[PDB]
Amino acid sequence: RTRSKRFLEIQKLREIKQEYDLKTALSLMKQMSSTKFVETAEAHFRLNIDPKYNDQQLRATVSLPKGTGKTVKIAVLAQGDKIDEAKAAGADIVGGEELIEQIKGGFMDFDKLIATSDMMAKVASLGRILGPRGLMPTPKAGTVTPNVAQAVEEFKKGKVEFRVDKTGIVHIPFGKLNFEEEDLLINLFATIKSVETNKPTGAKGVYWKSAHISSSMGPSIRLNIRE
């Protein structure tokens, strides 16, 4: 029997001083997501570099053990001989412009769609379904390229592009506060171990000042990158 807000509470279950580790900040980050629906878990890292320059900038990708990989049902859609290299690569389902009438019926047993540049003319019409669902392939995501083989096989690992802004802090949602416990560990760990190997040779001294793992709207927490 007691009335509370939405800050004082969470602010009590966390500490700024103590340096919570990966395993510790695990059963804590989930307790800080007492919000509607599924909240996303991010991770802010303070890099000691110079944003004004480019040689100091960091740009790469991290392979998240969970969220992506084989669990995903990527569907390949191309023509010509690009259809053969799709099945031999290891895709869930492959087909030409014939399956276009299938998705219109209600078949959406997929999460990742990729196609060439010689079919986008018709795929563009699906901007009403695949468009909003972000299922439509885009050049940026690299989902649109003649080398569909290296594409479908690439998503089989799953990556998350990341860079440095005018400040010098990097952050990429390694998942949500709904996933398991052991999962949120390998993802966060892989995120660091990956970005670390992308440090500029021009960097001098400590490359990391402090690491944090916050969510959509809630207090932060200093995470130990070493562990």
d(CA 215, CA 217) in angstroms, rounded, equals: 6
3-state secondary structure of 77: strand
User: Would you state the torsion angle of the CA atoms of residues 100, 113, 156, 118, taken in this order, to the nearest 10 degrees?
Assistant: 80
Q: After which residues is the chain broken (C to N over 2.5 A)?
A: none
Measured from the CB atom, the residue of 67 and 95 that comes closer to RNA is: 67
**CB contact at 8 A, 130 and 102:** no
12-41 binders of RNA (CB under 7 A): 36-37, 40
Measured from the CB atom, the residue of 90 and 131 that comes closer to RNA is: 131
Give every CB contact of residue 23 below 8 A, 6+ residues apart in sequence. 185, 227
107-126 binders of RNA (CB under 7 A): 120, 124, 126
Q: Binding RNA by CB under 7 A: which of 58, 93, 141, 186? A: 141
Minimum Å gap between C-beta 188 and RNA is 13
- How, if at all, do strands 169-170 and 175-176 pair? unpaired
Measured from the CB atom, the residue of 26 and 136 that comes closer to RNA is: 136
Tokens of 101: 């009438």
Q: Binding RNA by CB under 7 A: which of 69, 80, 90, 139? A: 139
Q: Examine residue 165 and tell whether it contacts RNA (CB under 7 A).
A: yes
Minimum Å gap between C-beta 135 and RNA is 7
Interface ranges with RNA (CB under 7 A): 36-37, 40, 42, 44, 51-53, 120, 124, 126-127, 131-134, 136, 138-141, 160-163, 165-169, 171-173, 214, 216-217
